[PDB]
Symmetry: C2
Subunit: 245 residues, 2 copies
Amino acid sequence: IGAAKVDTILEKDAYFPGEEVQGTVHVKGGKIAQDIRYIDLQLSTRYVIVKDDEEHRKYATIHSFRVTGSFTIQPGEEHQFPFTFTLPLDTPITVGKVEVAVVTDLDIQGGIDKSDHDRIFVEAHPWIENVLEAIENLGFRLNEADCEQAPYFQRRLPFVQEFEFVPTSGYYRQMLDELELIFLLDEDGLEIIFEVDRRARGLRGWLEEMYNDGEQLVRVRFSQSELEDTEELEEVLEEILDQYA
Amino acid sequence: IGAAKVDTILEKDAYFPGEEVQGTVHVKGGKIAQDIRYIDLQLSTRYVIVKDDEEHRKYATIHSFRVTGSFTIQPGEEHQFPFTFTLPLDTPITVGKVEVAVVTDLDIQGGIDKSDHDRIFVEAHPWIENVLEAIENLGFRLNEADCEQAPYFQRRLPFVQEFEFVPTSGYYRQMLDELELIFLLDEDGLEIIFEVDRRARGLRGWLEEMYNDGEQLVRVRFSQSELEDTEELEEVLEEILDQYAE
Ligand code: NA
Ligand code: NA
Protein backbone atom coordinates (compact mmCIF):
# COMPACT_ATOMS: atom_id res chain seq x y z
CA ILE A 1 0.00 0.00 0.00
CA GLY A 2 3.11 2.18 -0.56
CA ALA A 3 5.97 3.39 1.65
CA ALA A 4 8.24 6.14 0.30
CA LYS A 5 6.50 9.31 -0.91
CA VAL A 6 7.74 11.99 -3.32
CA ASP A 7 6.60 15.60 -3.67
CA THR A 8 8.02 18.32 -5.97
CA ILE A 9 7.53 22.06 -5.20
CA LEU A 10 8.51 24.78 -7.64
CA GLU A 11 9.05 28.25 -6.22
CA LYS A 12 6.81 30.06 -8.69
CA ASP A 13 3.54 29.41 -10.42
CA ALA A 14 4.48 31.03 -13.75
CA TYR A 15 7.52 31.12 -16.00
CA PHE A 16 8.25 32.04 -19.61
CA PRO A 17 10.82 30.38 -21.98
CA GLY A 18 14.44 31.13 -21.01
CA GLU A 19 13.59 31.71 -17.34
CA GLU A 20 15.14 29.61 -14.62
CA VAL A 21 12.87 27.19 -12.80
CA GLN A 22 13.98 26.43 -9.25
CA GLY A 23 12.39 24.09 -6.77
CA THR A 24 12.79 21.15 -4.44
CA VAL A 25 12.05 17.46 -4.58
CA HIS A 26 10.93 16.28 -1.14
CA VAL A 27 11.28 12.59 -0.39
CA LYS A 28 10.00 10.83 2.71
CA GLY A 29 10.83 7.19 3.40
CA GLY A 30 8.22 4.66 4.33
CA LYS A 31 7.99 1.98 6.97
CA ILE A 32 11.06 0.09 5.77
CA ALA A 33 14.11 1.39 3.97
CA GLN A 34 14.31 1.41 0.21
CA ASP A 35 17.11 1.81 -2.28
CA ILE A 36 16.56 4.83 -4.52
CA ARG A 37 18.43 4.61 -7.83
CA TYR A 38 17.78 8.20 -8.93
CA ILE A 39 15.49 11.21 -9.09
CA ASP A 40 14.63 12.54 -12.56
CA LEU A 41 12.56 15.54 -13.64
CA GLN A 42 10.76 16.03 -16.87
CA LEU A 43 8.82 18.79 -18.56
CA SER A 44 6.22 17.46 -20.95
CA THR A 45 3.21 18.51 -23.00
CA ARG A 46 1.05 16.88 -25.62
CA TYR A 47 0.56 17.34 -29.33
CA VAL A 48 -2.07 16.44 -31.89
CA ILE A 49 -1.78 14.00 -34.77
CA VAL A 50 -4.82 13.85 -37.01
CA LYS A 51 -5.33 10.57 -38.85
CA ASP A 52 -8.41 9.88 -40.98
CA ASP A 53 -9.98 13.06 -39.57
CA GLU A 54 -9.67 11.96 -35.96
CA GLU A 55 -7.43 13.48 -33.27
CA HIS A 56 -4.75 11.47 -31.42
CA ARG A 57 -2.90 13.26 -28.57
CA LYS A 58 0.66 12.16 -27.98
CA TYR A 59 2.89 13.00 -25.05
CA ALA A 60 6.22 14.64 -25.70
CA THR A 61 9.14 15.37 -23.45
CA ILE A 62 10.36 18.99 -23.70
CA HIS A 63 13.22 18.73 -21.25
CA SER A 64 14.73 16.10 -18.94
CA PHE A 65 17.44 16.00 -16.32
CA ARG A 66 18.53 14.07 -13.22
CA VAL A 67 17.85 15.73 -9.87
CA THR A 68 19.88 13.25 -7.87
CA GLY A 69 21.77 10.00 -7.99
CA SER A 70 21.42 6.81 -5.97
CA PHE A 71 20.97 6.91 -2.21
CA THR A 72 19.25 4.76 0.37
CA ILE A 73 16.21 6.14 2.20
CA GLN A 74 15.58 4.76 5.71
CA PRO A 75 12.35 4.72 7.83
CA GLY A 76 10.44 8.01 7.96
CA GLU A 77 13.57 9.77 6.79
CA GLU A 78 13.18 13.17 5.09
CA HIS A 79 15.36 14.34 2.20
CA GLN A 80 15.36 17.51 0.12
CA PHE A 81 16.94 17.72 -3.30
CA PRO A 82 16.93 21.29 -4.61
CA PHE A 83 17.21 21.84 -8.35
CA THR A 84 17.28 24.44 -11.02
CA PHE A 85 16.96 24.13 -14.76
CA THR A 86 16.31 26.55 -17.59
CA LEU A 87 12.99 26.47 -19.44
CA PRO A 88 13.78 25.65 -23.09
CA LEU A 89 12.94 28.39 -25.60
CA ASP A 90 10.59 26.07 -27.56
CA THR A 91 8.49 25.33 -24.45
CA PRO A 92 4.87 25.93 -25.55
CA ILE A 93 2.68 28.66 -24.05
CA THR A 94 -0.04 27.60 -21.65
CA VAL A 95 -3.24 28.73 -23.38
CA GLY A 96 -6.19 26.97 -24.98
CA LYS A 97 -5.82 23.24 -24.48
CA VAL A 98 -2.04 23.25 -24.05
CA GLU A 99 -0.78 22.17 -20.64
CA VAL A 100 2.81 21.87 -19.55
CA ALA A 101 3.60 19.43 -16.77
CA VAL A 102 6.60 18.86 -14.52
CA VAL A 103 6.88 15.10 -13.90
CA THR A 104 9.02 13.77 -11.09
CA ASP A 105 10.32 10.21 -11.45
CA LEU A 106 11.81 8.74 -8.32
CA ASP A 107 13.17 5.36 -9.31
CA ILE A 108 13.24 2.69 -6.62
CA GLN A 109 15.13 -0.50 -7.17
CA GLY A 110 12.88 -3.36 -6.30
CA GLY A 111 10.75 -1.15 -5.63
CA ILE A 112 7.61 0.19 -7.31
CA ASP A 113 8.75 3.56 -8.60
CA LYS A 114 7.15 6.76 -7.27
CA SER A 115 6.15 9.84 -9.25
CA ASP A 116 4.81 13.37 -8.95
CA HIS A 117 3.09 15.78 -11.37
CA ASP A 118 3.00 19.63 -11.18
CA ARG A 119 1.34 21.78 -13.81
CA ILE A 120 3.31 24.88 -14.73
CA PHE A 121 1.91 27.85 -16.57
CA VAL A 122 4.13 29.04 -19.34
CA GLU A 123 3.63 32.70 -20.16
CA ALA A 124 4.20 34.23 -23.61
CA HIS A 125 7.75 35.47 -24.04
CA PRO A 126 7.78 39.32 -24.12
CA TRP A 127 8.73 39.40 -27.83
CA ILE A 128 6.01 36.86 -28.61
CA GLU A 129 3.40 38.82 -26.70
CA ASN A 130 4.50 41.95 -28.64
CA VAL A 131 3.79 40.09 -31.85
CA LEU A 132 0.45 38.87 -30.53
CA GLU A 133 -0.72 42.30 -29.35
CA ALA A 134 0.40 43.79 -32.68
CA ILE A 135 -1.59 41.14 -34.58
CA GLU A 136 -4.76 41.73 -32.57
CA ASN A 137 -4.49 45.53 -33.05
CA LEU A 138 -4.56 45.04 -36.83
CA GLY A 139 -8.06 43.61 -36.58
CA PHE A 140 -7.49 40.04 -35.37
CA ARG A 141 -8.49 37.91 -32.38
CA LEU A 142 -6.69 34.83 -31.00
CA ASN A 143 -9.05 31.89 -31.46
CA GLU A 144 -7.04 28.74 -30.81
CA ALA A 145 -3.54 27.67 -29.91
CA ASP A 146 -2.49 24.07 -29.83
CA CYS A 147 0.53 21.88 -30.32
CA GLU A 148 0.40 20.22 -33.71
CA GLN A 149 2.46 17.50 -35.34
CA ALA A 150 5.17 19.14 -37.46
CA PRO A 151 7.61 16.67 -39.09
CA TYR A 152 8.01 19.06 -42.05
CA PHE A 153 10.06 21.56 -40.01
CA GLN A 154 12.47 18.95 -38.58
CA ARG A 155 12.67 20.89 -35.30
CA ARG A 156 14.09 19.78 -31.94
CA LEU A 157 10.55 18.87 -30.88
CA PRO A 158 8.11 16.80 -33.06
CA PHE A 159 5.42 19.51 -32.69
CA VAL A 160 5.01 23.27 -33.07
CA GLN A 161 2.56 25.54 -31.31
CA GLU A 162 0.06 26.85 -33.82
CA PHE A 163 -1.66 30.17 -33.06
CA GLU A 164 -4.87 30.54 -34.97
CA PHE A 165 -6.35 34.03 -35.22
CA VAL A 166 -9.76 35.08 -36.59
CA PRO A 167 -10.32 38.41 -38.36
CA THR A 168 -12.29 41.00 -36.32
CA SER A 169 -12.26 43.70 -39.01
CA GLY A 170 -14.13 43.84 -42.34
CA TYR A 171 -10.88 44.20 -44.30
CA TYR A 172 -9.23 41.04 -42.99
CA ARG A 173 -12.56 39.16 -43.02
CA GLN A 174 -12.48 39.88 -46.71
CA MET A 175 -8.82 38.87 -47.04
CA LEU A 176 -8.93 35.47 -45.30
CA ASP A 177 -11.06 33.10 -43.27
CA GLU A 178 -8.31 32.77 -40.64
CA LEU A 179 -4.64 33.48 -39.92
CA GLU A 180 -2.01 31.00 -38.58
CA LEU A 181 1.30 31.82 -36.84
CA ILE A 182 4.16 29.65 -35.58
CA PHE A 183 6.75 31.16 -33.27
CA LEU A 184 10.29 29.84 -33.28
CA LEU A 185 12.08 31.59 -30.43
CA ASP A 186 15.89 31.73 -30.19
CA GLU A 187 18.31 33.82 -28.08
CA ASP A 188 18.79 36.57 -30.68
CA GLY A 189 15.27 36.90 -31.99
CA LEU A 190 12.19 35.23 -33.25
CA GLU A 191 11.20 33.49 -36.48
CA ILE A 192 7.54 33.61 -37.58
CA ILE A 193 5.86 31.21 -39.96
CA PHE A 194 2.71 32.62 -41.58
CA GLU A 195 -0.11 30.75 -43.25
CA VAL A 196 -3.76 31.45 -44.08
CA ASP A 197 -7.00 29.51 -44.37
CA ARG A 198 -5.61 26.30 -42.89
CA ARG A 199 -8.94 25.57 -41.18
CA ALA A 200 -10.79 26.51 -44.31
CA ARG A 201 -8.65 24.03 -46.23
CA GLY A 202 -9.18 21.42 -43.54
CA LEU A 203 -5.41 21.21 -42.88
CA ARG A 204 -4.01 19.77 -39.67
CA GLY A 205 -0.39 19.28 -38.68
CA TRP A 206 2.61 20.34 -40.69
CA LEU A 207 3.59 17.82 -43.32
CA GLU A 208 5.56 17.59 -46.59
CA GLU A 209 2.41 16.80 -48.58
CA MET A 210 1.09 20.31 -47.99
CA TYR A 211 4.08 21.93 -49.75
CA ASN A 212 4.73 19.31 -52.53
CA ASP A 213 2.15 20.70 -54.99
CA GLY A 214 4.12 23.93 -55.15
CA GLU A 215 2.31 25.62 -52.31
CA GLN A 216 4.87 27.73 -50.49
CA LEU A 217 5.29 29.22 -47.08
CA VAL A 218 5.96 32.67 -45.68
CA ARG A 219 8.82 32.49 -43.21
CA VAL A 220 10.24 35.63 -41.67
CA ARG A 221 12.91 36.29 -39.05
CA PHE A 222 12.72 39.30 -36.71
CA SER A 223 15.69 40.26 -34.52
CA GLN A 224 15.51 41.59 -30.96
CA SER A 225 15.55 45.27 -31.94
CA GLU A 226 12.60 44.85 -34.27
CA LEU A 227 10.57 42.88 -31.73
CA GLU A 228 11.15 45.44 -28.98
CA ASP A 229 10.18 48.19 -31.37
CA THR A 230 6.35 48.18 -31.20
CA GLU A 231 5.19 50.58 -33.85
CA GLU A 232 7.24 49.37 -36.80
CA LEU A 233 6.47 45.85 -35.61
CA GLU A 234 2.76 46.29 -36.27
CA GLU A 235 3.40 47.96 -39.60
CA VAL A 236 5.86 45.35 -40.91
CA LEU A 237 3.38 42.70 -39.78
CA GLU A 238 0.66 44.57 -41.74
CA GLU A 239 2.98 44.62 -44.76
CA ILE A 240 3.55 40.86 -44.50
CA LEU A 241 -0.18 40.20 -44.18
CA ASP A 242 -0.99 42.40 -47.16
CA GLN A 243 0.58 39.89 -49.56
CA TYR A 244 -2.54 37.79 -49.06
CA ALA A 245 -4.81 40.28 -50.88
CA ILE B 1 35.49 -17.38 -37.77
CA GLY B 2 32.36 -19.27 -38.92
CA ALA B 3 30.09 -16.73 -37.08
CA ALA B 4 27.00 -14.74 -38.18
CA LYS B 5 27.88 -11.95 -40.61
CA VAL B 6 26.34 -8.62 -41.61
CA ASP B 7 27.19 -6.52 -44.67
CA THR B 8 25.37 -3.27 -45.60
CA ILE B 9 25.58 -2.01 -49.18
CA LEU B 10 24.32 1.43 -50.20
CA GLU B 11 23.52 2.13 -53.84
CA LYS B 12 25.64 5.32 -53.74
CA ASP B 13 28.50 6.56 -51.56
CA ALA B 14 27.53 10.26 -52.06
CA TYR B 15 24.38 12.19 -51.17
CA PHE B 16 23.31 15.69 -50.29
CA PRO B 17 20.76 16.57 -47.57
CA GLY B 18 17.15 15.79 -48.42
CA GLU B 19 18.11 13.04 -50.84
CA GLU B 20 16.91 9.48 -50.23
CA VAL B 21 19.51 6.90 -49.24
CA GLN B 22 18.73 3.38 -50.50
CA GLY B 23 20.45 0.11 -49.83
CA THR B 24 20.34 -3.42 -48.59
CA VAL B 25 21.41 -5.07 -45.36
CA HIS B 26 22.80 -8.59 -46.14
CA VAL B 27 22.87 -11.09 -43.29
CA LYS B 28 24.49 -14.56 -43.36
CA GLY B 29 23.96 -17.07 -40.57
CA GLY B 30 26.95 -18.53 -38.83
CA LYS B 31 27.62 -22.16 -37.98
CA ILE B 32 24.87 -22.24 -35.35
CA ALA B 33 21.34 -20.92 -35.57
CA GLN B 34 20.76 -17.58 -33.90
CA ASP B 35 17.91 -15.38 -32.76
CA ILE B 36 18.22 -11.86 -34.09
CA ARG B 37 16.30 -9.19 -32.11
CA TYR B 38 16.47 -6.43 -34.72
CA ILE B 39 18.55 -4.65 -37.35
CA ASP B 40 18.95 -0.86 -36.89
CA LEU B 41 20.71 1.67 -39.09
CA GLN B 42 22.27 4.84 -37.66
CA LEU B 43 23.50 7.97 -39.38
CA SER B 44 26.19 9.57 -37.26
CA THR B 45 28.98 12.07 -37.12
CA ARG B 46 31.30 13.58 -34.51
CA TYR B 47 31.57 17.08 -33.12
CA VAL B 48 34.16 19.03 -31.17
CA ILE B 49 33.84 20.06 -27.55
CA VAL B 50 36.62 22.28 -26.22
CA LYS B 51 37.36 22.36 -22.49
CA ASP B 52 40.33 24.26 -21.04
CA ASP B 53 41.78 24.51 -24.57
CA GLU B 54 41.68 20.77 -25.34
CA GLU B 55 39.60 19.22 -28.09
CA HIS B 56 37.36 16.27 -27.23
CA ARG B 57 35.42 14.73 -30.13
CA LYS B 58 32.03 13.25 -29.29
CA TYR B 59 29.91 10.81 -31.30
CA ALA B 60 26.44 12.00 -32.32
CA THR B 61 23.42 10.31 -33.88
CA ILE B 62 21.89 12.22 -36.81
CA HIS B 63 19.17 9.70 -37.63
CA SER B 64 18.13 6.28 -36.45
CA PHE B 65 15.50 3.74 -37.58
CA ARG B 66 14.73 -0.01 -37.48
CA VAL B 67 15.46 -1.99 -40.64
CA THR B 68 13.83 -5.13 -39.34
CA GLY B 69 12.50 -6.80 -36.23
CA SER B 70 13.19 -10.19 -34.69
CA PHE B 71 13.79 -13.40 -36.72
CA THR B 72 15.81 -16.62 -36.42
CA ILE B 73 18.59 -17.19 -38.90
CA GLN B 74 19.67 -20.75 -39.65
CA PRO B 75 23.29 -21.76 -40.19
CA GLY B 76 24.86 -20.23 -43.30
CA GLU B 77 21.47 -18.79 -44.28
CA GLU B 78 21.27 -15.55 -46.28
CA HIS B 79 18.69 -12.80 -45.79
CA GLN B 80 18.37 -9.47 -47.65
CA PHE B 81 16.69 -6.49 -46.06
CA PRO B 82 16.29 -3.56 -48.47
CA PHE B 83 15.79 -0.10 -46.96
CA THR B 84 15.29 3.58 -47.66
CA PHE B 85 15.56 6.74 -45.54
CA THR B 86 15.84 10.44 -46.08
CA LEU B 87 19.03 12.28 -45.19
CA PRO B 88 17.94 14.93 -42.64
CA LEU B 89 18.47 18.55 -43.75
CA ASP B 90 20.82 19.23 -40.82
CA THR B 91 23.23 16.44 -41.94
CA PRO B 92 26.69 18.07 -42.07
CA ILE B 93 28.63 18.41 -45.32
CA THR B 94 31.60 16.08 -45.61
CA VAL B 95 34.50 18.48 -45.99
CA GLY B 96 37.41 19.34 -43.73
CA LYS B 97 37.47 17.10 -40.68
CA VAL B 98 33.78 16.05 -40.81
CA GLU B 99 32.87 12.40 -41.24
CA VAL B 100 29.36 11.02 -41.73
CA ALA B 101 28.86 7.29 -41.35
CA VAL B 102 25.99 4.82 -41.79
CA VAL B 103 26.27 2.28 -38.98
CA THR B 104 24.50 -1.07 -39.03
CA ASP B 105 23.62 -2.56 -35.66
CA LEU B 106 22.49 -6.22 -35.76
CA ASP B 107 21.48 -7.21 -32.25
CA ILE B 108 21.69 -10.91 -31.46
CA GLN B 109 20.12 -12.31 -28.36
CA GLY B 110 22.83 -13.80 -26.16
CA GLY B 111 24.66 -13.41 -28.62
CA ILE B 112 27.53 -11.11 -29.50
CA ASP B 113 26.10 -8.29 -31.54
CA LYS B 114 27.37 -7.61 -35.07
CA SER B 115 28.04 -4.35 -36.79
CA ASP B 116 28.91 -2.68 -40.06
CA HIS B 117 30.28 0.79 -40.96
CA ASP B 118 29.79 2.58 -44.29
CA ARG B 119 31.11 6.09 -44.72
CA ILE B 120 29.11 8.46 -46.88
CA PHE B 121 30.22 11.66 -48.49
CA VAL B 122 27.64 14.39 -47.90
CA GLU B 123 27.79 17.10 -50.54
CA ALA B 124 26.92 20.75 -50.17
CA HIS B 125 23.33 21.35 -51.13
CA PRO B 126 23.18 23.70 -54.17
CA TRP B 127 21.92 26.75 -52.18
CA ILE B 128 24.83 26.31 -49.77
CA GLU B 129 27.23 25.85 -52.67
CA ASN B 130 25.84 29.10 -54.10
CA VAL B 131 26.55 30.87 -50.81
CA LEU B 132 30.07 29.37 -50.70
CA GLU B 133 30.91 30.42 -54.23
CA ALA B 134 29.42 33.87 -53.54
CA ILE B 135 31.57 34.33 -50.43
CA GLU B 136 34.78 33.26 -52.16
CA ASN B 137 34.04 35.58 -55.10
CA LEU B 138 33.99 38.51 -52.69
CA GLY B 139 37.57 37.68 -51.74
CA PHE B 140 37.43 34.82 -49.25
CA ARG B 141 38.82 31.28 -49.31
CA LEU B 142 37.26 28.37 -47.38
CA ASN B 143 39.74 27.42 -44.69
CA GLU B 144 38.13 25.07 -42.23
CA ALA B 145 34.83 23.32 -41.64
CA ASP B 146 33.91 21.28 -38.60
CA CYS B 147 31.03 20.26 -36.38
CA GLU B 148 31.14 22.31 -33.19
CA GLN B 149 29.28 21.97 -29.92
CA ALA B 150 26.36 24.46 -30.03
CA PRO B 151 23.87 24.37 -27.11
CA TYR B 152 23.32 28.13 -27.57
CA PHE B 153 21.22 27.62 -30.73
CA GLN B 154 19.11 24.83 -29.19
CA ARG B 155 18.78 22.94 -32.49
CA ARG B 156 17.64 19.35 -33.08
CA LEU B 157 21.31 18.27 -33.03
CA PRO B 158 23.80 19.29 -30.27
CA PHE B 159 26.22 20.69 -32.87
CA VAL B 160 26.34 23.00 -35.88
CA GLN B 161 28.61 22.87 -38.89
CA GLU B 162 30.87 25.94 -38.73
CA PHE B 163 32.51 27.13 -41.97
CA GLU B 164 35.61 29.30 -41.51
CA PHE B 165 36.85 31.50 -44.35
CA VAL B 166 40.08 33.48 -44.64
CA PRO B 167 40.19 36.93 -46.33
CA THR B 168 42.04 36.84 -49.65
CA SER B 169 41.74 40.54 -50.62
CA GLY B 170 43.24 43.68 -49.10
CA TYR B 171 39.75 44.98 -48.32
CA TYR B 172 38.66 41.91 -46.41
CA ARG B 173 42.07 41.49 -44.70
CA GLN B 174 41.56 45.02 -43.44
CA MET B 175 38.08 43.99 -42.25
CA LEU B 176 38.83 40.76 -40.39
CA ASP B 177 41.17 37.87 -39.67
CA GLU B 178 38.47 35.39 -40.56
CA LEU B 179 34.77 34.91 -41.27
CA GLU B 180 32.51 32.17 -39.82
CA LEU B 181 29.22 31.00 -41.34
CA ILE B 182 26.64 28.56 -40.09
CA PHE B 183 24.04 27.22 -42.50
CA LEU B 184 20.68 26.08 -41.17
CA LEU B 185 18.98 24.39 -44.09
CA ASP B 186 15.25 23.82 -44.26
CA GLU B 187 12.74 22.99 -47.01
CA ASP B 188 11.77 26.56 -47.98
CA GLY B 189 15.13 28.26 -47.74
CA LEU B 190 18.25 28.73 -45.73
CA GLU B 191 19.36 30.67 -42.64
CA ILE B 192 22.91 32.03 -42.29
CA ILE B 193 24.64 32.94 -39.06
CA PHE B 194 27.57 35.33 -39.49
CA GLU B 195 30.38 35.91 -37.06
CA VAL B 196 33.92 37.33 -37.43
CA ASP B 197 37.29 36.83 -35.74
CA ARG B 198 36.25 33.81 -33.62
CA ARG B 199 39.72 32.28 -34.03
CA ALA B 200 41.41 35.60 -33.27
CA ARG B 201 39.28 35.78 -30.15
CA GLY B 202 40.03 32.13 -29.30
CA LEU B 203 36.34 31.16 -29.30
CA ARG B 204 35.29 27.52 -29.92
CA GLY B 205 31.73 26.24 -29.90
CA TRP B 206 28.57 28.30 -29.49
CA LEU B 207 27.64 29.06 -25.89
CA GLU B 208 25.48 31.38 -23.77
CA GLU B 209 28.49 33.04 -22.11
CA MET B 210 29.79 34.23 -25.51
CA TYR B 211 26.67 36.36 -26.10
CA ASN B 212 25.79 37.45 -22.51
CA ASP B 213 28.13 40.50 -22.40
CA GLY B 214 26.28 42.18 -25.26
CA GLU B 215 28.21 40.59 -28.10
CA GLN B 216 25.82 40.41 -30.97
CA LEU B 217 25.34 38.04 -33.81
CA VAL B 218 24.19 38.49 -37.40
CA ARG B 219 21.37 36.13 -38.30
CA VAL B 220 19.70 36.31 -41.71
CA ARG B 221 17.12 34.18 -43.55
CA PHE B 222 17.27 33.74 -47.34
CA SER B 223 14.50 32.14 -49.37
CA GLN B 224 14.83 29.72 -52.26
CA SER B 225 14.44 32.46 -54.91
CA GLU B 226 17.19 34.59 -53.41
CA LEU B 227 19.52 31.59 -53.05
CA GLU B 228 19.06 30.56 -56.66
CA ASP B 229 19.85 33.96 -58.19
CA THR B 230 23.57 34.17 -57.70
CA GLU B 231 24.34 37.84 -58.53
CA GLU B 232 21.82 39.30 -56.17
CA LEU B 233 23.17 36.80 -53.64
CA GLU B 234 26.74 38.12 -53.75
CA GLU B 235 25.60 41.69 -53.40
CA VAL B 236 23.33 40.87 -50.47
CA LEU B 237 26.27 39.08 -48.85
CA GLU B 238 28.57 42.07 -49.57
CA GLU B 239 26.00 44.34 -47.84
CA ILE B 240 25.69 42.02 -44.82
CA LEU B 241 29.48 41.92 -44.45
CA ASP B 242 29.72 45.73 -44.74
CA GLN B 243 28.58 46.08 -41.16
CA TYR B 244 31.98 44.70 -40.10
CA ALA B 245 34.07 47.28 -42.03
CA GLU B 246 33.58 49.57 -39.03
NA1 NA C 1 4.07 18.59 -6.31
NA1 NA D 1 29.24 -1.99 -45.54
